[PDB]
Amino acid sequence: CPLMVKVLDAVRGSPAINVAVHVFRKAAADTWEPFASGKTSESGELHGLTTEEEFVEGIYKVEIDTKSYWKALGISPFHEHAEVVFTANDSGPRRYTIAALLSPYSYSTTAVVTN
Amino acid sequence: CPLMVKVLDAVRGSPAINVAVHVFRKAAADTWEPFASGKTSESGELHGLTTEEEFVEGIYKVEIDTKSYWKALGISPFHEHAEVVFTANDSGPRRYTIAALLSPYSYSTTAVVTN
Amino acid sequence: CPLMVKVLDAVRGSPAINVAVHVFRKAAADTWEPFASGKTSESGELHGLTTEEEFVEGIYKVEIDTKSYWKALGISPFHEHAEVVFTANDSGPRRYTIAALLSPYSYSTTAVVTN
Amino acid sequence: CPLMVKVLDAVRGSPAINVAVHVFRKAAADTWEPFASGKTSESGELHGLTTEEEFVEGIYKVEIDTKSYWKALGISPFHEHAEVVFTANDSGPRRYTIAALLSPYSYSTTAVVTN
Numbered sequence A, B, C, D: 001c002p003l004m005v006k007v008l009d010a011v012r013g014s015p016a017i018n019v020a021v022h023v024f025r026k027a028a029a030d031t032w033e034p035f036a037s038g039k040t041s042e043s044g045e046l047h048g049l050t051t052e053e054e055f056v057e058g059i060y061k062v063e064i065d066t067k068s069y070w071k072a073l074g075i076s077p078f079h080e081h082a083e084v085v086f087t088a089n090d091s092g093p094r095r096y097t098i099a100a101l102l103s104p105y106s107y108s109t110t111a112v113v114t115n
Ligand SMILES: O=C(O)c1cc(-c2ccc(F)cc2F)ccc1O
Pocket: A008, A099, A100, A101, A108, A109, A110, B106, B107, D006, D008, D099, D100, D101, D108, D109, D110
């Protein structure tokens, strides 16, 4: 699993469950093409987005649908979504964990990249 | 000044100086139109992006050019840039400060909205 | 003002107002002696804690009374307080800003050190 | 495993390996008694600190030795350590993950609490 997304809720101290995630890959025409999508599990994790074969070098955008998450909890948050844009696999295949920690008016994102 | 941007460097414990910032407004055609831009000052702040008259309700994107910042310091970063996407709402007089704290493999962003 | 404290609220997107802050200096007997204290202002800032003459090199602890802050808002928090422990060094003229961003189950702290 | 500690490095985008962690529990005499200690693994995680039987209700302090970690990497960081102080098990037994994300002049900590 070369690309995993993990989302946590800083208000409740819990995984952020059922968060929609959309991944895009930049195409030669300077356009974002849909690449993979899913929702976080009860553990706040989203596995199985892609395979080593399909996850080639490129610029990828991970959009985490934070506004939909907060609204379902009755909170009107500031951001529309969190976007994580990065070059992947430019030095060869790597495994990427994109983690996000969410509050209504703030979020943090970190990448853990392993060989 | 209804919209200000402040950027900090978590590696050096300093304002992030000379960081390029581009602001876009979402247009009816589902496209990002350039709205304002600048570079952060010696205090890490970018003032004067817009006016009360021009900063109407809508969806805005603030792109912070973090990759160039780390490259100028000789540090290998993860993200292409940091993107902050939000709706501006007329809920009474408001000032929006978009703050970002930068590390090579992580960033956090918060909105401070005051009257 | 060589030492300033700034506190933000990541749930409301606002300065954290009326937060008690206590500063201690490490004494030779491996004990924390009270040094300065106050409450954050309407801007979330606490100025005037010390002077250049009194703020000598040493180990300092800044305790931010986060639990009382969340309790006043009716939100159940995790931490008893946030603690920031650091050495102050005479590396030339310096001003220290200790910033903290608060959520019920998470906080971040950064030092901005400027000349 | 009712108490686990996870540490990440925001400069390298990696687990923070070999980070020393000391846990203390507040005793009736208003004193911190040593409770457990260990070092993070190659995955940045520290398991096996305590048992359900020994991890009773109380106020606990988790000290993460961040300064020693950064110095071994040739970085002089701002903080002496990160301290996480919290009441545990006051509503019955819970499982606690204390996560910390480290940069030289900044850190963030979050708790994930599950039943
Ligand atoms: O940038 C973030 O999203 C972030 C993430 C963590 C964190 C990382 C990994 C993990 F397993 C748990 C966490 F809380 C802790 C703090 C933080 O700011």
